[PDB]
Each structure stands twice: as C-alpha cells, then as structure tokens.
Amino acid sequence: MSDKKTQTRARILGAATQALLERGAVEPSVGEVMGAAGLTVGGFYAHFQSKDALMLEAFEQLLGKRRELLGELDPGLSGKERRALAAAFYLSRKHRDAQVDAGCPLPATLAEVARLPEGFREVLSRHVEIMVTSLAESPEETDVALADLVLMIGGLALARALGPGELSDRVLRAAKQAVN
Amino acid sequence: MSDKKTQTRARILGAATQALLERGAVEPSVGEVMGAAGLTVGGFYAHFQSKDALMLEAFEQLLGKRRELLGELDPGLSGKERRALAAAFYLSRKHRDAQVDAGCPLPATLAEVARLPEGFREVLSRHVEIMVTSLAESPEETDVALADLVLMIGGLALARALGPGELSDRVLRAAKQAVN
C-alpha cells in the first residue's frame, strides 16, 4: 500500500539502476530512463534534481544492497568460507548476463568513477572498506579479501565483455577458483 | 624521415589511443581527438572512415603493443616467473596514473565492449587467448594465467577508480601479491 508519488519515484529509480548496472552512469540519458519506466519525460525533475543525482542515488542503493546480501551469509562461516561463498554468488553466468535481482554496478561503472562527481568515488571507497573488513577474519586476510574483490569485479567485467560462450564461462571459473 | 600525410594520421591515432586509454571508446568525440592532436577538425575524414573505425584501430594497436611488451620478457623464465613480472609491470602507480608509454586499454574499455562494434570483442578474445597461452607453461596453468590477467585488469581498474592514495596503492599491492 503506497501512493502515486512514491511509486513513480521508485519506477524512475528502478529504470535508472537497471541502466546503471548494464551501461554505467555516463551513457544513459534522462529520456532513456523515463522511456524505460514508461513515464512521460517531463515528469523527471519533479522527482530528481539532475541525471547525476539520480545515478549517484542508484549507485549508492545498489551498493548498499550488495552489502546487505553479504550480511545474509552465515555469521559462523570462516573468512575463507565467506569469501568462497561471496565469489560463487558474484561470478555466475546469471550475474554476468544481468539476470539477477540485485546486480553489482562496479563492472559497468569503475572506468567512469574518476570523471564522475566525487560522491561516486566516496561511496566506492567506503563500500570497499566495509566489504573487506567483513570478509577478513584477521589482519593477514585484509589483502586476500581485497584481491578476492578484484577477482570478482574484474572477472565479471572481463566475462561480460567476452559475451556468453566457452571463453567467458572459463573466465568466471578461473576467477572463482583463484579466490583464497 | 617521413611525410605530412603519414605524420598527420599518426598524430590523430596518437590522440585517439590516449583518449581511449583514459576515457574508453564511447565518450571521446572526433572534435576532442582532433583538438588534442592540434589539428583542424575537417581533416578527420581524409584519414579515417568513422570514429568507430579510428577507435577500433587504436584498440587493436594498443593491445598488439601489450603483446609485444610481454614478448620481451626473458624466454628462459618459468610460467610463474613470467606471470609475476607481467603483474609487476601492469599493476604500477605509473600505469594506474596513465604515465606509461604503452598503456593497456582494457580497464577503460571492458564495460563498453558488449555495445561496441563486434571487432572490439573479436580482438579482445584473441588477445586473451594469445596472452594466456604465452603465460601458461602447462595445461594446469591456463586457469592460473587467466585469473592473473583478471587480477591485473581488475586491479588497475579498481585502483584507478579509487584515485591516488593509500587505499588505491593497497589495491595494486594486494592484486599483485595474489598472482600465482
């Protein structure tokens, strides 16, 4: 039970998050997002100040959700176990193919962060810090967790670029198998 | 010793490769490239059919050069040694900061490959295949080399996104240290 204002904003942000996951923060236009929301385009600025404010919120939301998902892992798992599980969830064909409910925006957006508003870099840095801390059970595991995040984000990025097929499937497997 | 046609084309491609390394293949405009070449902009189509043909050539050239550099590694090195050396050359602050002579375009471009002309994916696939084959000394090392390439490309991508600083430096180190 809701209302049309709340619903309409949510629809716009939903279209934005989808575009961001797939095409990053630079390419998508207000026209495309509103288009994909099945909304008239004039309505945009009643809900958001700018395209960049919209995409930053989409980015923050998606990342917050990835952190929530990681929070759902069994608290009793070792560092190594949790990292293996995180890797298996991240480095899947479904995630590669944008067929998951809460995709990670990093493969699509990392290359743009340096030229985007500072909020993107700020949220990114904090996201990495929080994730690593949660995946490392001891100070010796900090670097292992960081390299594992690299295997996840990089592995998915490379696999997606290659497109569905044997090579791409092998990239996902190899990246998963190297997680420590 | 050369000529003005050869020189002018080379200047255009030089500006293109630079833009590609830093900002990928989608963002840069003909105007920006010619601008950065200190050329009048009308001259473009005397040398290239389209922006996409230019960027594909820039991409192929940069990747060919990365393969050449890897070819310069001592033939007597083990698989493991060559992978460690490749990683140390790739995962540097200078490479992160676009202060190398022959940078890798993959961090900046991977996210765009799926929506670019097919030549990008084709060249990418071949590049990965050739590199892995050259870094693996036995079939068991194929997956190790692939994961190492992921640590390189992904590590540089994440470090660049974070920008200069301690966290970014740590990403480079952690990624290098995980290479096997």
Side-chain angles (χ1 to χ4, degrees):
Chain A
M1 196 159 85
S2 192
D3 68 84
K4 308 279 245 196
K5 185 183 174 182
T6 304
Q7 201 164 68
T8 297
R9 192 183 196 278
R11 285 170 67 186
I12 293 167
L13 193 60
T17 58
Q18 274 297 304
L20 176 70
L21 280 172
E22 297 166 353
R23 304 184 284 127
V26 176
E27 198 149 45
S29 59
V30 169
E32 278 151 20
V33 172
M34 294 303 280
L39 296 172
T40 283
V41 175
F44 180 77
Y45 293 96
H47 298 278
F48 297 90
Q49 334 151 221
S50 65
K51 196 191 83 143
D52 280 358
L54 166 76
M55 295 299 243
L56 179 54
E57 188 178 340
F59 190 74
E60 292 166 339
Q61 173 177 96
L62 286 164
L63 291 175
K65 182 71 170 227
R66 298 299 307 183
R67 294 195 304 276
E68 195 175 322
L69 292 172
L70 198 87
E72 298 191 302
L73 300 184
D74 172 8
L77 303 173
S78 67
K80 218 180 162 312
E81 287 167 334
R82 295 212 308 302
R83 297 187 301 267
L85 275 81
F89 276 127
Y90 197 105
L91 288 161
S92 69
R93 293 182 289 276
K94 293 278 274 196
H95 193 197
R96 182 196 59 202
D97 295 339
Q99 299 163 341
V100 295
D101 284 342
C104 180
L106 301 184
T109 68
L110 277 187
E112 296 166 348
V113 168
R115 74 195 80 100
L116 284 164
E118 193 66 16
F120 284 86
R121 176 168 284 165
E122 293 179 341
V123 165
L124 176 63
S125 312
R126 175 179 315 126
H127 181 77
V128 173
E129 292 169 339
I130 293 166
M131 306 241 73
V132 163
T133 299
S134 73
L135 292 166
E137 286 284 4
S138 65
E140 323 92 51
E141 296 179 9
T142 300
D143 280 358
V144 178
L146 207 39
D148 289 349
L149 278 169
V150 170
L151 285 162
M152 290 179 235
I153 302 159
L156 202 79
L158 179 54
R160 193 173 279 162
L162 292 164
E166 291 180 34
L167 183 51
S168 181
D169 285 357
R170 192 155 185 183
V171 170
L172 294 172
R173 237 143 51 224
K176 261 186 286 193
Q177 289 167 7
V179 167
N180 281 331
Chain B
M1 196 159 85
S2 192
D3 68 84
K4 308 279 245 196
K5 185 183 174 182
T6 304
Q7 201 164 68
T8 297
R9 192 183 196 278
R11 285 170 67 186
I12 293 167
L13 193 60
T17 58
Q18 274 297 304
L20 176 70
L21 280 172
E22 297 166 353
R23 304 184 284 127
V26 176
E27 198 149 45
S29 59
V30 169
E32 278 151 20
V33 172
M34 294 303 280
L39 296 172
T40 283
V41 175
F44 180 77
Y45 293 96
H47 298 278
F48 297 90
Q49 334 151 221
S50 65
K51 196 191 83 143
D52 280 358
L54 166 76
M55 295 299 243
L56 179 54
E57 188 178 340
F59 190 74
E60 292 166 339
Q61 173 177 96
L62 286 164
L63 291 175
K65 182 71 170 227
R66 298 299 307 183
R67 294 195 304 276
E68 195 175 322
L69 292 172
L70 198 87
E72 298 191 302
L73 300 184
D74 172 8
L77 303 173
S78 67
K80 218 180 162 312
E81 287 167 334
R82 295 212 308 302
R83 297 187 301 267
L85 275 81
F89 276 127
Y90 197 105
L91 288 161
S92 69
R93 293 182 289 276
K94 293 278 274 196
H95 193 197
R96 182 196 59 202
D97 295 339
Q99 299 163 341
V100 295
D101 284 342
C104 180
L106 301 184
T109 68
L110 277 187
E112 296 166 348
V113 168
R115 74 195 80 100
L116 284 164
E118 193 66 16
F120 284 86
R121 176 168 284 165
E122 293 179 341
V123 165
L124 176 63
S125 312
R126 175 179 315 126
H127 181 77
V128 173
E129 292 169 339
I130 293 166
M131 306 241 73
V132 163
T133 299
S134 73
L135 292 166
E137 286 284 4
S138 65
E140 323 92 51
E141 296 179 9
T142 300
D143 280 358
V144 178
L146 207 39
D148 289 349
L149 278 169
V150 170
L151 285 162
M152 290 179 235
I153 302 159
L156 202 79
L158 179 54
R160 193 173 279 162
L162 292 164
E166 291 180 34
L167 183 51
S168 181
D169 285 357
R170 192 155 185 183
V171 170
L172 294 172
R173 237 143 51 224
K176 261 186 286 193
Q177 289 167 7
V179 167
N180 281 331

